[PDB]
Amino acid sequence: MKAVVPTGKIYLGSPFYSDAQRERAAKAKELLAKNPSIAHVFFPFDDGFTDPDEKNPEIGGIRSMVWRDATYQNDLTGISNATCGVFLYDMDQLDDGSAFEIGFMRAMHKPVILVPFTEHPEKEKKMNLMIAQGVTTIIDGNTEFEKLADYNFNECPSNPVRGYGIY
Amino acid sequence: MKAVVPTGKIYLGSPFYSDAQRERAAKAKELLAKNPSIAHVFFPFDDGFTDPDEKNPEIGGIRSMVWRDATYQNDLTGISNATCGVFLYDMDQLDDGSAFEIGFMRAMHKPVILVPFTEHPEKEKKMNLMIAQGVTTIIDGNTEFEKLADYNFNECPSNPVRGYGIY
Amino acid sequence: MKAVVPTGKIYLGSPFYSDAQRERAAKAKELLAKNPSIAHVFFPFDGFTDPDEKPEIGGIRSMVWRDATYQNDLTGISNATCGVFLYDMDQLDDGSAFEIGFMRAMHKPVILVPFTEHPEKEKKMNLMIAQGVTTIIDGNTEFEKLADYNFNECPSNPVRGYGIY
Amino acid sequence: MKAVVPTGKIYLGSPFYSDAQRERAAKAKELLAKNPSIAHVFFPFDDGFSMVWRDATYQNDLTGISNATCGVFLYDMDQLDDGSAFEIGFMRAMHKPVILVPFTEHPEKEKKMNLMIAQGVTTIIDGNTEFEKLADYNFNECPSNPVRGYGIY
Amino acid sequence: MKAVVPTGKIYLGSPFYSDAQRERAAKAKELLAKNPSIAHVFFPFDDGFSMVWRDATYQNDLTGISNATCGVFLYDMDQLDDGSAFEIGFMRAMHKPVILVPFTEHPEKEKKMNLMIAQGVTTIIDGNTEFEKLADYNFNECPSNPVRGYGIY
Amino acid sequence: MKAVVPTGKIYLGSPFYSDAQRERAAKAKELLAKNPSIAHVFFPFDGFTDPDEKPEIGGIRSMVWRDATYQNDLTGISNATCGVFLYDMDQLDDGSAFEIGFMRAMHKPVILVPFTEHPEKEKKMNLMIAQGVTTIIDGNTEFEKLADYNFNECPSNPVRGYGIY
């Protein structure tokens, strides 16, 4: 089933405010860029919509409804265009925006690659059932991050989450 | 458009481990029980699946794949049967399981009622864009919790999230 | 098969500007209200108020009002089991058409109740709509069966007798 | 929680008038009618409507699946019905729960099931052993019950 | 990010052979062909196939919508096409982005749009003012651009 | 309209037990492999390994293997643009049928390539499948066009010449 051309279209989900998270995304892009099976990678934070009537826009502050609708839509559009999702999922500071997108994608029957990260590998290992059962493939970000450059995104082989306590 | 019979089928999403959360759900049920527009309310934590081959099952610990699949499915089945979602959303400790369900439901074009709770009403007021834009109706849990007994679940009038900083 | 309770949940779509439109919708309601297989009926014009909108129908509306109103409609479509469209064949309403496509994409049954006021012109209909709708009830002569139609099962009734384009 | 009123809307999928099958569907209808959690039950063969007949009947079935909240399939394991299988897959794609009720007149034979069906269905109720359960099953919530005990291919 | 290859698959929705319309679709095809982000463009009237013709043609269009990644509609504001509107609603229900390209030969008249269309579409590109943009628009990501400047009803 | 790149993404569904089945699928691949409108082809039997499964085909499989395998198939269906089913009319495969229904619910085009090995029996076909499939290519005499069929657009081709049941 070798692809004649790359067909993997990635929706790269991830927070992007403070460092560490911004760094993860950076390397993620690099790895995916090196992957032969990828045709396109979409990252919600690259572009950005500008609402002419919105003065002194501040991130985290009150935003115009026009900016909100267009930005939210850009993300749903990215999910729509994608064939699969890749989420740089911080296990230390759960991101509800990412979890929402994971559920939205699974509702559309799309495969979802979870790439969990933790700075406390010695602390408890537990995951919410919806995330644990919702994702179709798990790739540890702390010790297997680099396989994003080799994973066959044309078919996304499944790999159930295991080894995590579930609640 | 008065309903001839109750048609609202609620999927009540909410964490249910430690107190406070368990208490919120309790009162939520009571309010919904008093609502004339509700035909059924589903709460994932009421029943529970038992896997005969699973000995000494512990919540938060390793669970059998059979238990995981059946429990996860019970929840998706609840979402499928529901006409709308009601989420007792802890703004202090974001729950990714709930966020996942919100996204799954919105992917199915179903209305979602967000009922946010916060023990720090004086701290910053901010919400993730996906949640803020994804939900169709917001009812403050801290000061408007009781309108769950009167909200017309037969039609779920929209009420966009506003007053929250967005990130 | 004999509903132990009405299960029909109608999304009633139709324009609501002119006296004519308001009329058809008024009778539509009365009829459906007599149908025993209906548990609920939703009509988009029965509204949202944007506290921060200093508003004029047909004018520039706030994005908040637009989002809330558009959603109330999608919400009615989500909740509904089937759609009933008072389709004016003389003044094609793209809002209604949009909704018909939305509902069909969701695989829900759609009942088209067309009106023409101009019998002289050849009865034509766009391909999408002719093929998209699952049941047609002529409004000019069959408007009455909306009170008898079994919305618990929504029997099929292909569109015929219309030039397709 | 306890439903303020019957919420379950069943799409009863089953082959017909080919001996026994007609009997199965018959008893099933009776059992379901005794169930307090059901608001409505649809059976593609009760009511009835060339490419015109085909489309209308096909559509009448998709409409039944659309209005339905869950699917119940009197699944004959001795003669696989692709119509029912198509419908099971259609309902699962819509995220709707599916109750499989397998029947076999040959228990002496291998006990096997296609993976898509075994994993696709959310609840199994054996037709030869617990057919009567259709009258007690809570269709307002359709509790899951994974398929087990079947060799899979 | 920059696509390793054209990813956009356009479903071009437009009325046909009714004067002007044929011209619009014509130029649109040329503009899209110049777009480096497009992998494929489907136009319901190019290729062509009674209830047999109806079903086949209808289906050929739903198949085009299915394979499509986005929708581009040459929307005539002077004569509302319910076919295109049906398709816009169908694509939005599938969560696919829709580019609306409105055209009007009467700018002196009121500027109004039905709410379902104004809110349903995700990106607007005026046909009279910026038709040429179809050649530059990045169809690999379909950036949103909400409808504004239209009275809504 | 002349794809600036192949866009066809086929989900090839079919049983893979007997020599006959393995054959049809083998030729199916070779054919599709010659088609220039295909960008990718997915065949479910090309597998998952459960590290904790001490395994026998057709036997009791671990739930982990079942979930992973079932998902790889749904994943192939999600990624695909259309389905191609080598449908054995003599030994109806409910797994393939399930997938055909799943794909149609997603509104994707489905190409049925039936085989019969028993021309003597009247050509019959279940209603769902006859109406569900969007294009039929006889495998006993038209197997070859899978190498020419334009999967970029997937031209429709209604099922006819089969007793419906």
Side-chain angles (χ1 to χ4, degrees), chain A residues 3 6-17 19-21 24-54 57 59-118 120-125 127-142 145-167, chain B residues 3 6-17 19-21 24-54 57 59-118 120-125 127-142 145-167, chain C residues 3 6-16 18-21 23-26 28-29 31-33 35-53 55 57-116 119-120 125-140 142-152 154-165, chain D residues 1 3-4 6-17 19-21 23-28 30-46 48-104 106-109 111-128 131 133-153, chain E residues 1 3-4 6-17 19-21 23-28 30-46 48-104 106-109 111-128 131 133-153, chain F residues 3 6-16 18-21 23-26 28-29 31-33 35-53 55 57-116 119-120 125-140 142-152 154-165:
Chain A
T7 67
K9 294 189 275 170
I10 313 302
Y11 177 78
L12 180 60
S14 164
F16 200 63
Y17 194 57
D19 299 302
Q21 301 190 313
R24 291 170 181 162
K27 200 175 192 302
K29 297 171 179 291
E30 291 173 51
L31 297 170
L32 298 172
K34 294 186 177 183
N35 200 312
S37 71
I38 299 186
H40 179 269
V41 178
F42 180 84
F43 189 56
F45 292 105
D46 288 342
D47 278 54
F49 178 77
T50 299
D51 168 14
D53 295 299
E54 188 175 43
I59 290 186
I62 293 183
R63 303 310 299 281
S64 74
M65 190 65 281
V66 172
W67 182 84
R68 288 171 55 179
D69 285 329
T71 304
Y72 174 70
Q73 181 55 61
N74 282 335
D75 289 9
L76 296 194
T77 284
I79 283 157
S80 175
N81 292 335
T83 58
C84 68
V86 180
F87 295 81
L88 283 26
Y89 208 67
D90 188 323
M91 291 303 283
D92 296 343
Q93 191 61 294
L94 302 177
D95 187 298
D96 56 347
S98 288
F100 170 104
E101 302 171 316
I102 291 177
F104 197 103
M105 293 195 83
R106 291 306 287 142
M108 301 179 92
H109 293 110
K110 301 187 168 189
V112 172
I113 311 298
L114 186 71
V115 179
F117 286 96
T118 62
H120 301 172
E122 79 299 324
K123 286 189 175 182
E124 292 188 58
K125 192 178 181 185
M127 184 184 293
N128 193 95
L129 174 73
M130 307 311 288
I131 299 301
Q133 221 54 28
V135 310
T136 52
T137 299
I138 182 171
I139 292 175
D140 190 70
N142 285 292
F145 198 172
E146 296 189 303
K147 50 180 53 192
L148 286 184
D150 295 60
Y151 186 75
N152 180 357
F153 284 105
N154 283 287
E155 318 187 333
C156 305
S158 305
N159 185 56
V161 174
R162 293 206 285 178
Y164 278 88
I166 293 183
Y167 63 86
Chain B
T7 67
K9 294 189 275 170
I10 313 302
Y11 177 78
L12 180 60
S14 164
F16 200 63
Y17 194 57
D19 299 302
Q21 301 190 313
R24 291 170 181 162
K27 200 175 192 302
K29 297 171 179 291
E30 291 173 51
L31 297 170
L32 298 172
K34 294 186 177 183
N35 200 312
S37 71
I38 299 186
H40 179 269
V41 178
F42 180 84
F43 189 56
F45 292 105
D46 288 342
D47 278 54
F49 178 77
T50 299
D51 168 14
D53 295 299
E54 188 175 43
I59 290 186
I62 293 183
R63 303 310 299 281
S64 74
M65 190 65 281
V66 172
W67 182 84
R68 288 171 55 179
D69 285 329
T71 304
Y72 174 70
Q73 181 55 61
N74 282 335
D75 289 9
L76 296 194
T77 284
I79 283 157
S80 175
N81 292 335
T83 58
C84 68
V86 180
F87 295 81
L88 283 26
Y89 208 67
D90 188 323
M91 291 303 283
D92 296 343
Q93 191 61 294
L94 302 177
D95 187 298
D96 56 347
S98 288
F100 170 104
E101 302 171 316
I102 291 177
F104 197 103
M105 293 195 83
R106 291 306 287 142
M108 301 179 92
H109 293 110
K110 301 187 168 189
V112 172
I113 311 298
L114 186 71
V115 179
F117 286 96
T118 62
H120 301 172
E122 79 299 324
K123 286 189 175 182
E124 292 188 58
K125 192 178 181 185
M127 184 184 293
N128 193 95
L129 174 73
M130 307 311 288
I131 299 301
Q133 221 54 28
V135 310
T136 52
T137 299
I138 182 171
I139 292 175
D140 190 70
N142 285 292
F145 198 172
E146 296 189 303
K147 50 180 53 192
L148 286 184
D150 295 60
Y151 186 75
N152 180 357
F153 284 105
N154 283 287
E155 318 187 333
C156 305
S158 305
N159 185 56
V161 174
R162 293 206 285 178
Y164 278 88
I166 293 183
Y167 63 86
Chain C
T7 71
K9 296 193 292 183
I10 310 286
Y11 175 75
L12 186 57
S14 168
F16 204 63
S18 68
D19 298 301
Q21 309 181 314
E23 290 180 58
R24 303 170 185 173
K29 287 189 183 180
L31 293 171
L32 300 171
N35 201 311
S37 65
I38 299 174
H40 179 262
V41 166
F42 180 82
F43 188 51
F45 290 94
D46 293 337
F48 180 77
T49 289
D50 179 18
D52 301 63
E53 200 179 12
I57 295 178
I60 298 298
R61 302 309 302 273
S62 65
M63 191 55 74
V64 175
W65 178 88
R66 286 168 52 173
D67 284 324
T69 308
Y70 175 70
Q71 182 58 56
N72 284 335
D73 290 356
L74 294 193
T75 289
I77 285 176
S78 170
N79 175 64
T81 54
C82 70
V84 171
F85 295 91
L86 284 59
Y87 210 65
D88 190 310
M89 296 299 276
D90 299 336
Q91 181 177 57
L92 297 176
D93 183 297
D94 53 345
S96 291
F98 172 100
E99 296 168 320
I100 293 175
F102 200 92
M103 292 191 87
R104 287 307 281 151
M106 296 180 89
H107 290 112
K108 297 182 182 190
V110 173
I111 289 179
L112 192 72
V113 185
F115 295 89
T116 178
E120 337 80 7
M125 190 188 291
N126 184 93
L127 175 61
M128 326 300 287
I129 188 60
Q131 289 308 86
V133 172
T134 60
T135 298
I136 182 175
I137 292 182
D138 188 80
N140 288 301
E142 301 185 297
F143 203 6
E144 198 74 60
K145 42 195 59 181
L146 283 182
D148 308 306
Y149 189 80
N150 172 34
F151 283 109
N152 284 309
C154 291
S156 297
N157 183 60
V159 177
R160 212 197 73 60
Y162 279 91
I164 310 299
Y165 65 83
Chain D
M1 313 188 307
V4 180
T7 281
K9 289 187 287 179
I10 320 305
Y11 178 75
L12 185 62
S14 171
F16 214 50
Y17 283 137
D19 296 298
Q21 309 182 321
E23 179 181 61
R24 289 167 170 166
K27 186 182 177 185
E30 296 177 55
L31 289 170
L32 291 169
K34 302 181 180 61
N35 201 309
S37 70
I38 305 179
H40 177 263
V41 183
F42 180 87
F43 183 60
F45 294 75
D46 289 310
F49 178 67
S50 64
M51 191 58 83
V52 189
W53 179 80
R54 293 172 55 182
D55 281 305
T57 309
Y58 178 68
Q59 185 59 59
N60 276 332
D61 291 333
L62 289 203
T63 285
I65 290 178
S66 175
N67 301 317
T69 181
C70 59
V72 171
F73 292 87
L74 279 24
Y75 211 71
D76 174 50
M77 296 297 285
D78 299 343
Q79 181 178 58
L80 302 176
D81 174 44
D82 56 349
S84 296
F86 171 98
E87 301 175 317
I88 288 167
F90 196 105
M91 291 192 79
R92 289 307 286 137
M94 299 186 86
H95 298 297
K96 291 180 172 179
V98 172
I99 313 298
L100 189 78
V101 187
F103 287 92
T104 181
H106 292 73
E108 80 277 23
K109 296 187 175 184
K111 198 175 181 184
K112 300 184 181 186
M113 189 179 284
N114 189 102
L115 172 66
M116 309 312 287
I117 301 299
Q119 220 62 13
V121 301
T122 55
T123 298
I124 183 170
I125 292 177
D126 193 77
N128 298 295
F131 198 6
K133 288 177 179 173
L134 285 182
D136 311 301
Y137 191 77
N138 183 349
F139 284 103
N140 289 313
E141 289 168 41
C142 298
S144 303
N145 187 49
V147 171
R148 298 186 63 278
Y150 285 83
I152 294 175
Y153 61 84
Chain E
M1 313 188 307
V4 180
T7 281
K9 289 187 287 179
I10 320 305
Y11 178 75
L12 185 62
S14 171
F16 214 50
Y17 283 137
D19 296 298
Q21 309 182 321
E23 179 181 61
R24 289 167 170 166
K27 186 182 177 185
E30 296 177 55
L31 289 170
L32 291 169
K34 302 181 180 61
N35 201 309
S37 70
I38 305 179
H40 177 263
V41 183
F42 180 87
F43 183 60
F45 294 75
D46 289 310
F49 178 67
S50 64
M51 191 58 83
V52 189
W53 179 80
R54 293 172 55 182
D55 281 305
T57 309
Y58 178 68
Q59 185 59 59
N60 276 332
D61 291 333
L62 289 203
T63 285
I65 290 178
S66 175
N67 301 317
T69 181
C70 59
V72 171
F73 292 87
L74 279 24
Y75 211 71
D76 174 50
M77 296 297 285
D78 299 343
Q79 181 178 58
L80 302 176
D81 174 44
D82 56 349
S84 296
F86 171 98
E87 301 175 317
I88 288 167
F90 196 105
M91 291 192 79
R92 289 307 286 137
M94 299 186 86
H95 298 297
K96 291 180 172 179
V98 172
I99 313 298
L100 189 78
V101 187
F103 287 92
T104 181
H106 292 73
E108 80 277 23
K109 296 187 175 184
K111 198 175 181 184
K112 300 184 181 186
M113 189 179 284
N114 189 102
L115 172 66
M116 309 312 287
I117 301 299
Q119 220 62 13
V121 301
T122 55
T123 298
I124 183 170
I125 292 177
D126 193 77
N128 298 295
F131 198 6
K133 288 177 179 173
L134 285 182
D136 311 301
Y137 191 77
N138 183 349
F139 284 103
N140 289 313
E141 289 168 41
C142 298
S144 303
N145 187 49
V147 171
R148 298 186 63 278
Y150 285 83
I152 294 175
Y153 61 84
Chain F
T7 71
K9 296 193 292 183
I10 310 286
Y11 175 75
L12 186 57
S14 168
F16 204 63
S18 68
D19 298 301
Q21 309 181 314
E23 290 180 58
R24 303 170 185 173
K29 287 189 183 180
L31 293 171
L32 300 171
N35 201 311
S37 65
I38 299 174
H40 179 262
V41 166
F42 180 82
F43 188 51
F45 290 94
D46 293 337
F48 180 77
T49 289
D50 179 18
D52 301 63
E53 200 179 12
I57 295 178
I60 298 298
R61 302 309 302 273
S62 65
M63 191 55 74
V64 175
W65 178 88
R66 286 168 52 173
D67 284 324
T69 308
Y70 175 70
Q71 182 58 56
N72 284 335
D73 290 356
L74 294 193
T75 289
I77 285 176
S78 170
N79 175 64
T81 54
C82 70
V84 171
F85 295 91
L86 284 59
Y87 210 65
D88 190 310
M89 296 299 276
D90 299 336
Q91 181 177 57
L92 297 176
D93 183 297
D94 53 345
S96 291
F98 172 100
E99 296 168 320
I100 293 175
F102 200 92
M103 292 191 87
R104 287 307 281 151
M106 296 180 89
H107 290 112
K108 297 182 182 190
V110 173
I111 289 179
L112 192 72
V113 185
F115 295 89
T116 178
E120 337 80 7
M125 190 188 291
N126 184 93
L127 175 61
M128 326 300 287
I129 188 60
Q131 289 308 86
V133 172
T134 60
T135 298
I136 182 175
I137 292 182
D138 188 80
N140 288 301
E142 301 185 297
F143 203 6
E144 198 74 60
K145 42 195 59 181
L146 283 182
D148 308 306
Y149 189 80
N150 172 34
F151 283 109
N152 284 309
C154 291
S156 297
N157 183 60
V159 177
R160 212 197 73 60
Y162 279 91
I164 310 299
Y165 65 83

